[PDB]
Structure formats: C-alpha cells, structure tokens
Amino acid sequence: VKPNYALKFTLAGHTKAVSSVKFSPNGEWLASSSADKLIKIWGAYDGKFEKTISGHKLGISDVAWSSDSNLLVSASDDKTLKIWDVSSGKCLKTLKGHSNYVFCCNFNPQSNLIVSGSFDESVRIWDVKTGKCLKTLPAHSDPVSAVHFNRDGSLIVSSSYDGLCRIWDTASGQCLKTLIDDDNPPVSFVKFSPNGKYILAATLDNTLKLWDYSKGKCLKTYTGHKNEKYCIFANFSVTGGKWIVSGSEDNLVYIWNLQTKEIVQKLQGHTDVVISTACHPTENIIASAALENDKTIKLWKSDC
Ligand SMILES: C/N=C(/NC)NCCC[C@H](N)C(=O)O
C-alpha cells in the first residue's frame, strides 16, 4: 500500500505567510492562521472560503480547535492568545500573561483548558471559561516550539529550541520526563500519537523521530525531507494507511510509511516552504500551507 494523494483545491486569500492549518474535530472546516494577523475558515471538503476572523495586533503563529468544533484559540506575536466563537466571530477572551511572542497552543480534549508556549520560554495553562492563567511552567531555556495534550488531558508535551522535549503533569505542573537526543538539536515540533503512547518530534537536523517517552527510547526515525530553519508541523495519518506526514523546506509535502520509514509519496505544487500540514479526522484528506512567496493552502485527497 502507498497512498495516492492528488491536489483538489488551492485556497488563496492570506496576504502574508500562512503559519498553521487545522481541521475541525467534526471534519467540516479548516482553520488557517497567518502572519497577516488573520484567521480564515474554509470548507474542509470543497475548500470554499467561509469567513475571516480578525483582532490580533500582530501575526499569528498557531490556531487550534475545541473538541466540539465551536471555538478556536490563536497564538500571536502580540503576546496574547485569543479564544474565538467561530460561528459568531466573537473574541470571547484575550489571554494575557506571556512576556513575549506566543508561538503554539492547544485545547485539552475536555476543552476546559488551553496550553500555550512562548518565546518567553514558558508553558502556560489557562482556564477557558474565565481566561485566567492557572499555571506558569518554567519549561525551557529557549523558545517553546510546540505544546500538546495527550488523549485524556492528563499530560502535556512541550518542545523547544533548547533541544528538549518535556512531559508535564497537567494537574500539578510537575515535569515528569525530559527526553534527551544526541547533540541536542533544536526541537521544532512535537505532538502525541492519536492513542497517546508515543510522541512524534521534529528536530532541525532534517529528522523526525517517534519516541516511547516513558521508556525514553527512539522507535523510528524519518528522513529525506529538508528541515533546518523553520518550525514545521508533522502528523500521524490514521484514516487509511498508517502514515507520517510533514512539510519541508524544499516546498514538498512528505509522506512516510510509519512502520517501515520509507517515503511513500512526495506532493508537489507549493512554491515556498511547506510550514504546516494537517490530516482530516475521518477522510483521507491532507491540508498543507506555505510561506510568504506562496501564501496558499492546498487540499489533497487519496483513496487510502
Ligand atoms: C505553532 N507552530 C508552528 N510550527 C510548528 N508554527 C509555524 C511557524 C511560525 C513561524 N513564525 C514562522 O514563520 O516560521
């Protein structure tokens, strides 16, 4: 089995670099954030432009959906996160506390908490209802590139340019694990596997690694792409074959067989760095997005 992802839609509208794309958990929508200070909403299946959500004062590095698909959270260079009601476009809360660019964010599965990571080297945990910061974790000694909750929300994983991935207990704020990788190259992205047993980490030595984070063992290594400068999203694709999906600094989307580590497809079409990819929750659809010289988002579909 290889997949046969083919380009179906190209989504144009952002006027600066796209930073993040994410499918809604209900599969209906794609949300995009950009250096143009905007969030856009698009139809997940047809790429149809839906609406623009605005209000940040500087560029946005990340956006993320609540579990019920009703809210977004965005992370901005203006040092804030904003919580958005997607249907009305309202800014429900502005989360203030970080002392530098907010880079990454996510809801927990219950979606009563938001985790954020910042250039201020901290990870912050927030109450969605009140907008109050509940915990500030002294997480890293360099900017925080990613933060993600596990499947039951009891753990947080963070990555940083300091070369570390750390595992945090959500309830206590305690650091439970530090993962150490030879020569400590900057970690540019991390997330949990859908089942929560592993983490997938990207490092700025053109490498993705799948870790058993409890045992602290590297189980798989994926290479062949280019990633030495930018924080590029990576994904588990689970709707068809079991793949790993990433952007790349050679303007391609890469797809690997998870088990064998072989490159099974490379998707051509973008004209600048592919900074973000996302995988649709029930259908074999990949969304990708590119930097300043391209500015477009692409929807690719496969039969497996
Ligand atoms: C939140 N996570 C990201 N990547 C993992 N964001 C995209 C990179 C944004 C960065 N300012 C840039 O333009 O490179």
Side-chain angles (χ1 to χ4, degrees), residues 2-47 49-196 198-214 216 218-304:
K2 303 201 176 202
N4 63 334
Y5 280 95
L7 182 60
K8 302 296 184 176
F9 303 101
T10 302
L11 285 51
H14 286 292
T15 57
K16 296 202 194 157
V18 185
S19 54
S20 192
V21 298
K22 304 290 178 68
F23 285 110
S24 57
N26 72 2
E28 294 282 284
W29 314 104
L30 187 76
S32 63
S33 57
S34 166
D36 73 6
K37 315 179 216 279
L38 309 171
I39 293 167
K40 297 178 180 281
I41 309 301
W42 322 76
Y45 303 108
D46 67 357
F49 171 76
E50 183 72 10
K51 70 163 84 184
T52 293
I53 296 171
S54 64
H56 278 295
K57 300 192 162 195
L58 291 175
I60 304 175
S61 287
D62 206 0
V63 69
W65 292 91
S66 65
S67 287
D68 65 359
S69 305
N70 289 324
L71 309 177
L72 290 169
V73 64
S74 54
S76 177
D77 289 349
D78 71 14
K79 310 180 177 162
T80 71
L81 306 100
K82 290 175 178 280
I83 305 172
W84 306 94
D85 182 75
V86 181
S87 288
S88 68
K90 289 172 180 185
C91 180
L92 300 179
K93 294 292 181 182
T94 299
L95 307 182
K96 298 179 148 180
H98 282 295
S99 62
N100 209 332
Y101 312 138
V102 192
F103 196 73
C104 47
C105 54
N106 264 310
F107 285 94
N108 63 343
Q110 185 180 332
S111 301
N112 64 312
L113 303 177
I114 282 155
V115 64
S116 66
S118 163
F119 266 56
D120 73 12
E121 314 183 349
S122 77
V123 167
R124 282 177 145 82
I125 299 167
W126 312 80
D127 184 63
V128 171
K129 196 149 208 162
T130 62
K132 301 304 155 60
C133 188
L134 300 177
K135 292 198 169 66
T136 302
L137 315 189
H140 288 285
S141 58
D142 273 305
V144 180
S145 57
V147 287
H148 197 224
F149 282 99
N150 72 338
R151 203 189 66 78
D152 70 4
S154 60
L155 299 178
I156 293 164
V157 64
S158 64
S159 55
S160 166
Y161 283 90
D162 72 9
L164 307 180
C165 295
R166 283 176 159 159
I167 300 290
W168 307 86
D169 184 88
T170 304
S172 65
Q174 186 185 193
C175 187
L176 299 179
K177 309 281 180 166
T178 293
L179 298 185
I180 303 299
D181 194 28
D182 302 324
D183 297 77
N184 313 308
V187 189
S188 43
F189 183 71
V190 73
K191 79 191 293 181
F192 289 107
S193 59
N195 64 83
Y198 313 107
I199 61 170
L200 176 67
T203 43
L204 294 186
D205 58 356
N206 318 287
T207 309
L208 286 151
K209 296 191 194 83
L210 186 71
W211 292 82
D212 175 351
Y213 54 86
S214 62
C218 179
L219 307 178
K220 306 287 170 173
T221 302
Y222 310 92
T223 67
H225 65 309
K226 187 79 170 307
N227 189 197
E228 297 183 341
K229 190 172 174 183
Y230 297 98
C231 289
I232 298 180
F233 288 90
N235 306 279
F236 296 84
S237 178
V238 298
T239 50
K242 304 315 191 229
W243 324 119
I244 296 296
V245 178
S246 175
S248 178
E249 285 156 10
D250 62 2
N251 315 345
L252 306 177
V253 178
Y254 282 68
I255 313 182
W256 296 263
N257 175 303
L258 186 145
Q259 294 302 332
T260 78
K261 311 158 285 181
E262 300 163 305
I263 296 171
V264 292
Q265 210 174 357
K266 295 155 67 165
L267 319 181
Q268 176 172 235
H270 286 289
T271 65
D272 203 350
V273 176
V274 184
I275 194 74
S276 171
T277 51
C279 295
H280 194 276
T282 59
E283 302 298 321
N284 300 322
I285 305 179
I286 288 163
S288 56
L291 295 188
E292 185 74 4
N293 300 345
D294 178 332
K295 312 162 200 203
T296 73
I297 295 160
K298 293 181 185 277
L299 290 170
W300 317 77
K301 306 189 184 190
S302 176
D303 302 312
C304 65

